[PDB]
Design a protein around this ligand. Sequence first.
Ligand code: U15
Ligand code: CO
Ligand code: CO
Ligand code: NA
Length: 263
Amino acid sequence: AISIKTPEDIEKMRVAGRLAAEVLEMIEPYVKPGVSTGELDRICNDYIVNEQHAVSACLGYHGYPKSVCISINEVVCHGIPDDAKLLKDGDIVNIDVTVIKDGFHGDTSKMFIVGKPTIMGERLCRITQESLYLALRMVKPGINLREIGAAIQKFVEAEGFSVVREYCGHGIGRGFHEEPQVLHYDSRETNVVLKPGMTFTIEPMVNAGKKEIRTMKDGWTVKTKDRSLSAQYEHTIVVTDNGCEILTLRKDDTIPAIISHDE
Ligand SMILES: COC(=O)[C@@H](CC(C)C)NC(=O)[C@H](C)NC(=O)[C@@H](O)[C@H](N)c1ccc(C)cc1
Ligand SMILES: [Co+2]
Ligand SMILES: [Co+2]
Ligand code: NA
């Protein structure tokens, strides 16, 4: 039950992925010491609705209260935007955006480092991005997803980091979450052979310590069991005839929008 997108659908995904990407570009100047995450969420929502004439896919989804997720330091994912929550020097910060435009979803996140990098935050963010990028470079018709999960996990662990098991990338299109599940580690269960026009996300969560996570008493916030740092990047892609196209590319990405394995 993997959706194959038509060229008209893929074009709608390009628009929606571009808007999601542009939310993350827009917000970047506002990501500063002493800004609250509640404020950042406010800026993002206004932009999505008022300017982009889009909607947040996150708002209301399984009851999620805000328009974007903002996750700091040892928060793994689903960090809830909040006014007592102030950014400060050294923080690593994930903003994860999903927009619906013209029926189609675009889903992307990046890390921002606030004020002065700590060495360890820098390394973790860089390795996590490189883990996404290497997975992106493998995407092409006829490869299996199992191969890709296995490659991400190998790279990350070689750094003495760990891969979060509980959250995975996913098909995306008219549905926020569609088949397949894209696991960022090796599993016998995986057996999806990629085909031109599947669209999905890859979104590895990498912990500097151990892979175990815990959910907080707000019912949303996910943290490392061990309080070590955690980082995540996410891109929405379409499988093309000889590679992939990243639908959520930003100006700060250092990988090409179109990755071609063709002679
Ligand atoms: C184990 O997988 C899950 O728990 C569910 C969470 C439910 C409550 C939405 N799925 C996810 O967390 C997925 C994997 N997350 C994402 O797709 C994020 O990329 C996406 N932007 C997002 C979706 C939904 C929420 C509440 C937050 C972020
Ligand atoms: Co996301
Ligand atoms: Co996602
Ligand atoms: Na984090």
